[model samples]
Target chain A: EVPDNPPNEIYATAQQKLQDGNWRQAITQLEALDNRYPFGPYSQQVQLDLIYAYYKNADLPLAQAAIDRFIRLNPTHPNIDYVMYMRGLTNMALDDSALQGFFGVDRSDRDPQHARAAFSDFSKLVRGYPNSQYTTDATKRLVFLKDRLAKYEYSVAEYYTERGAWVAVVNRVEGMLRDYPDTQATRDALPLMENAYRQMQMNAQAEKVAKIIAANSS
Target chain B: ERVVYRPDINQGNYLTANDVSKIRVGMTQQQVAYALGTPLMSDPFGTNTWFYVFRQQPGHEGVTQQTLTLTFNSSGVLTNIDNKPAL
Candidate 1:
């Protein structure tokens, strides 16, 4: 027997499931509502709620797919800011795992592709929607991402140092300092750059970094 | 001795010796792709050339790099294969 249900009632039930923190049940109801009424009055909210439900269920890939689909279909949706915020959160979640947290693993030296993607997503949200309600939180995330990326660069610079590649160290550190100014990595970076310059016999550049370091210390 | 944790880093197309052996001249682009997977990089301006580069950085070990370059003709038949030993 086909259990044909009204879209409105299905949505209401889905909302109740979401309110009760039953993300799996909410997703099932939302998918049913979406299938029954492809472009109904509650279609937009259904899609958004599906994204939230997928995220809550820790289905990051599915959440990212849903978020991408929503953006592609509704580029000018009124809640695009929220969509972008969720996109950033989903991508950040993809970057690391609970195991890393449990073991206190430092992921800075690892590939930062997902973190870079999240940083770009958050940056776009902050730039495109300056006054959005999510802008403040997105801005904070941008700060953290920038620091994370800077730390990654610092690790690479240290790696180059171990390899005795002074030029690579200088280039990596200079670019990191340029892109991520005022981060903790920036403070720790001056010494690396200074040592790199001195190793390469660029005494003038090394002294310039020394002066900058003294200025920051004071 | 206290052991430190260092995660392995692998990037780009991870072609095996068998994967490399499967590529043959006169094979179509689609056939090559099917056999070897899509290339890691291709020339933006030129569609005929593809690069499959793999880099691995093992924990507390030096990095290793490998590369395979494929070139196709105008009719989409793979024409040349340039394989470099891992460095």
Candidate 2:
């Protein structure tokens, strides 16, 4: 049960809990404060605090919901960039599974929906807030996300190659190169494209790809 | 003889033979989704069709692919079930 205290006192107590690393207690207090005084002076801070508490408590979906609400409600708020960065972080966490690392699993062939969402979030953060403090880290994460997505595309192309679907293989590789030209997967996919052309008996196309691969090697 | 270790690569939703056997025609879309989980691929243009594609590349064996296709009527009743190799 939430105590019938003033919003200031409740916010102070929530801050204390947050500082103590008690995320669950902080969430309860922050949520109570928001409920009691939605438009109070501490309302915005309470919402932000709730998001942080939910994230620290590993409630990723809740964190994402809170971030989305905050952005929708306060589009021009001073901390909008921070909220955007948190959205990207939450999505990135959602894309990962603890079992993948524990079992040494390669998830590149799996669905990449969440990863693509996180990539879009980070890309928006960097493009909209070039001078924000989080832009640098967001930029780095964008590169990582691109590499992951490219690897996924490469896996799909490899699957097609193994099935002798030369036309599908060529189409997948072409799309991958068009979208992720700078990734290592792009470099590795050249050989697959060449072999696919060879299988289809397209000597001129195969020769063109072979020349590109040789240039990449040099 | 020395052999390299290759970890098994299992991708998409894993639909067992038993689970696939459980699907029946004339079931509601909700019932089908509950029994077999959400499909792995559903084209936006073809909202009435659901595709459950599974791919497994076992470390010591050739890659295997299985797909189950479900077609729903306009009222969202399961009308057809197609179990075939993945495209």
Candidate 3:
């Protein structure tokens, strides 16, 4: 319903609903404001509020869309940092189920597509706004995501190894070592790569990888 | 009637009423593990049951000899509980 009140009154009501944590109510009022005053004075703030409301209400698709739209629409806006940070945070929170962590499900077995997206999003935000307050947290999340990314690569190599695709396993492991350097998976990757070489009867290559693993270990 | 008394042999974690009480209906398998410790026996079929077994010598009174089977659904939600002490 389009509010009959003036723009300020509608914005005030929406703000009140947001402060009260009434996400649905706030969305209703804010959407009304958006419809009635598309380019009005409160349009920018309305978009920000809408992103938060959608996120809090667990409407992930809407939240993602809103944050991305804000970023595209306000690239030069003073509050672009917040929008980028929210975009990274939104991707990080997607589909994280408590049950998965509880059962000790192998990270390698799970898909890393969402994690990769979050990593890229956060990486851009950190690189673009190094002095932003969110940069510190974004850096920490990057470290964690790097580990997950490495494990996911190792998980893929394991699948290839199981099917007796020794050459494919070696390629995957080598790619993992190159792309995700300095991760703990280096230990796993070196060994798996060595074994893959051995399975292919490439003793020279196996020994070479073994030497690298030994040097790294020491 | 005359009866002979002997000590009961109890193995695995001793689950008291408190441990069982801590197990809520919607708890995950890991949550159950945190509350009750790892089960003595794993699910023979799938990732469903938290099985704990105990054996008693002489099968005497005042000795609790039972098999506790805590059932969970596929998503690890705790469901039914079957605890029966053999006489």
In order, how many clashes per candidate?
A: 0, 0, 0
- Candidate 2 regions exceeding 4 Å error are A99-104, B1-87
What value does the lDDT take at residue B69 in candidate 1? 62
**A50-152: candidate 2 lDDT, tens digit per residue:** 7788888888898888776677654446566777687777788788656657767876667677888888888778877879988888888888678888888
Candidate ranking (TM-score, best to worst)? 2, 1, 3
* Model 2 accuracy (lDDT, Cα): 0.72
lDDT, candidate 1, equals 0.72
Isolated chain B TM-score per model:
0.72, 0.70, 0.71
TM-score winner between candidates 1 and 2:
2
Instruction: Quote the lDDT for A70 in model 1.
Output: 77
Ten-residue stretch with the least lDDT total in model 3 chain A:
A196-205
lDDT (Cα atoms) of all candidates against the true structure: 0.72, 0.72, 0.69
Give DockQ per model, in order: 0.02, 0.03, 0.01
Here, model 2's chain A TM-score works out at 0.92
**Local error of candidate 3 at residue B39 (angstroms):** 50
